[PDB]
């Protein structure tokens, strides 16, 4: 049975192909001790335990902006994935890894090198996250809107191939949305500044926030009735109430000025993306905008994307926003789907093929 690990900017999603959810979802962060001597009597901590010991540890996000940057910490994440979470020996399972769009050549070779020479897998493959997300929705052509923890990508894909010339990247996603939520709830009176309070504000975000269909009437409705307010109960029992904060926060995705960013907005980058593609394929793209990842999970986001792209596109363009219900983990699910196809058994990179040509083989097999 083949493994599927989504190497995410803030969460690693790992599991077994054939299942339709990852078994393990844990913070993709490595912690080492802050002062020696918390070490006397035992080395390093990964994942859920390293957030529990944040105060005796110096956290590092080895994959903060979607591209893995620290290979010693990635080695340890993957080791924790295989041996603690899934509880398997990697020599015993072909392994499908995901990569970010526009992933350097060498980052791909180094992924392959580690998987064969450090975990001694029989087989492996590397697919682009967005492509997997498109596959899980039964398309092989569209534009995927991938918004995770540390990075968002708008990724046009034509007959399975992500187009390097038109992929747009954008360093605003959930981590930034969670901090803004912190900021504005503080301005309201409720103090959230500690790393422990940051954790509750992430819960408040994923449970109560939503996208306004138009920002202004929602503000007007907030300013003129109680209907939008929602009570939220903290861990120590205190109850607080969230008002326009509920939608002011995810609004940051269409108005990065809210955070000081002079960027465009997930709708403008989507259009900009589509317009670096050949005219002949834009109609297909516009009719297959696929939303994907944890940060597209806000109620109302499909409908506003519909509205805003309709405002940017030519007046006859047929426009579809596809936002699956499973899109929190649709990268991984497309991975699970792919690994399971029988025809995919002819496409693994084999242990044999690897020491015949070394890590550069990834370029000739995975594209």
């Amino acid at each position: 049975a083949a493994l599927v690990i989504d190497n995410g900017s803030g969460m690693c999603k790992a599991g077994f192909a054939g299942d339709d959810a990852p078994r393990a979802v844990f913070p993709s962060i490595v912690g080492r001790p802050r002062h020696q001597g918390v070490m006397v009597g035992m080395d390093s901590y990964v994942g859920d335990e390293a957030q529990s010991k944040r105060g005796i540890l110096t956290l590092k996000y080895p994959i903060e902006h979607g591209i893995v940057t620290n290979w010693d910490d990635m080695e340890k994440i993957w080791h924790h994935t295989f041996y603690n979470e899934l509880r398997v020996a990697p020599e015993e399972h072909p392994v499908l890894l995901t990569e970010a769009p526009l992933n350097p050549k060498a980052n791909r070779e180094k992924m392959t090198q580690i998987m064969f020479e450090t975990f001694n897998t029989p087989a492996m493959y590397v697919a682009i996250q967005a492509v997997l997300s498109l596959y899980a929705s039964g398309r092989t052509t569209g534009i995927v809107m991938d918004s995770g923890d540390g990075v968002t990508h708008t990724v046009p894909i034509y007959e399975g191939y992500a187009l390097p010339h038109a992929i747009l990247r954008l360093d605003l996603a959930g981590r930034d949305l969670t901090d803004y939520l912190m900021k504005i709830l503080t301005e309201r009176g409720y103090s959230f500044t500690t790393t422990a309070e940051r954790e509750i504000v992430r819960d408040i975000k994923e449970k109560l926030c939503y996208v306004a269909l138009d920002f202004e009437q929602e503000m007007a409705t907030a300013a003129s009735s109680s209907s939008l307010e929602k009570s939220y109960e903290l861990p120590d029992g205190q109850v607080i109430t969230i008002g326009n904060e509920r939608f002011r926060c995810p609004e940051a995705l269409f108005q990065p000025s809210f955070l000081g960013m002079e960027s465009c907005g997930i709708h403008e980058t989507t259009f900009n993306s589509i317009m670096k593609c050949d005219v002949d394929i834009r109609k297909d793209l516009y009719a297959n905008t696929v939303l994907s990842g944890g940060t597209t999970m806000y109620p109302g986001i499909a409908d506003r994307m519909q509205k805003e792209i309709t405002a940017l596109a030519p007046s006859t363009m047929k426009i579809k926003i596809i936002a699956p219900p499973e899109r929190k983990y649709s990268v991984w699910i497309g991975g699970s789907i792919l690994a399971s196809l029988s025809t995919f058994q002819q496409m693994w990179i084999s242990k044999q093929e690897y020491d015949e040509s070394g890590p550069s083989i990834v370029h000739r097999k995975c594209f």
């Binding site: 196809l341 025809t343 496409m347 370029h363």
Partner: protein, 347 residues
Amino acid sequence: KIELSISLSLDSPKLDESDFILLSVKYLEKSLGKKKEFSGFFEDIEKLYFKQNYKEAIEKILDFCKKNESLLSEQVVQRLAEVAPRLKSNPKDNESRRLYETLYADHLESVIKQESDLSVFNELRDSYNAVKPEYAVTHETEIKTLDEAKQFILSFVMLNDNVELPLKAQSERYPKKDRSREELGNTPSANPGIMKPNSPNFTDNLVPVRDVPKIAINEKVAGGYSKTKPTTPFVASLSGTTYSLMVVLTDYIEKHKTDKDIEKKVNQIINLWISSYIKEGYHSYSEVVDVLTEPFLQSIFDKANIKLNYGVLDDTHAEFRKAQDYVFGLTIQSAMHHELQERFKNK
């Protein structure tokens, strides 16, 4: 494994004549290994493939496949021979050949880089300074590096639609050009050479993103080149600029006729020209070579005792191998996509 892979690979709907040739040979290089005995069939197929001689080479492949039937899979030769009579080529869509020719342009350029002492291009400065129109700048720098000659050779386009019109007009091939006039603008691309902006590509074979021309075929041209030679990929049709190169070369040959190494040195130009025109995406191989080989241009060389090799190389093995992998990847992905979408229907 390999028997079932080529099986899947052959199921593809979009499989073209050049895809089949590469897919076939990959099978026989794995099945019959490097037994020397067939070493020359492999060598001959690659040489016929370069010369775009798909008919002869597909003929040679089935027939080799009959006369070695017990050595192979009867399942695989049946699909090979059943699929062959229905194989076409599509100049809009010749992706395996685009990637081959583009890798070949690099092999050719590097062969010239260790062959040429760059004296021919320094000698050629004078033939250009003589036949250039008045609005074209003279070249007065010395050509020290091969890029410096690459940019020089390319600047002959300055002669176009003026100096080369006398001998353009003696062609009967060139009126059957079929580049559409409709100006289409520029599309961004990260593939090199003659590849399509949208086609898959090995992720070590990318090039930095920049704009390139979209050009269309007229398709309503009677006897048009795209129609008569569908094996060659369309980039911009027949290369008119190469009459401009022939006006410069005619002058060069005239005033170096007694040169003993004249044949050596004219092939360095003709070939560097060919490599650069593919590498820069102006034209595919045949779009250049098929205006060069027309018999009224061939006189010019024959009467001066010059035999052109046309950039035909000793071996193309690396670039041929690389192309096999490419069509292998693409056609198994095709298979995988078909399994994928027929699993969603059933949900």
